[PDB]
């Protein structure tokens with residue numbers, strides 16, 4: 653009776669965002685960008701002067717985190733307390749704060765019900781780190797999108813250059829190196845692929861190939 657869910661987990665810069673949107677549109681399903689939740693929580697903490705390195709301080713904020721997401725009128729907008737912060741949550745200051753807040757056990761549990769509420773018919777495409785291992789363990793379809801850290805740093809560099817930002821590959825390689833250690837080195841819902849997850853390594857695959865392989869797999873298990 654419950655709605656089917658396709659989980660897409662993987663490290664930062666693996667291309668989950670792009671894949672999820674493409675699958676959601678292809679199947680006309682709902683989307684959940686769990687990372688945006690942790691980022692909106694982080695931005696909230698910064699604006700409310702809540703200690704980002706304090707589990708006690710963060711828990712209250714997470715439990716009442718006022719965040720809504722708007723459908724695809726073209727893309728997706730993240731709202732915090734009535735204000736669009738879609739761009740601000742994508743800043744390095746918020747990305748860093750987000751990994752900080754997502755590290756605490758009680759803070760993550762305080763966000764479980766909120767993420768799980770996204771499971772609604774006809775289906776949900778869930779993007780994150782632990783969608784297939786903690787949030788939605790029973791997902792009929794689980795995908796682990798991964799790629800070498802070097803490639804993910806290279807793609808990042810290029811995207812920042814497109815936007816007109818001056819970058820340095822060495823810095824980006826360390827940046828993703830540090831994020832990977834966090835998401836993967838924490839006794840609390842670490843980044844690990846589910847045993848039944850399709851491991852999609854996109855290092856030498858194009859956006860088109862990834863989407864094609866993902867949909868082939870998902871459609872296979874759901875019809």
Ligand SMILES: Nc1ccn([C@H]2CC[C@@H](COP(=O)(O)O)O2)c(=O)n1
Nearest residue numbers: 686687688690750751754780781782
């Ligand atoms: N399901 C998730 C999604 C995200 N995060 C953390 C990883 C860093 C931060 C932001 O994630 P993203 O870079 O994917 O926006 O939140 C997490 O712990 N669990």
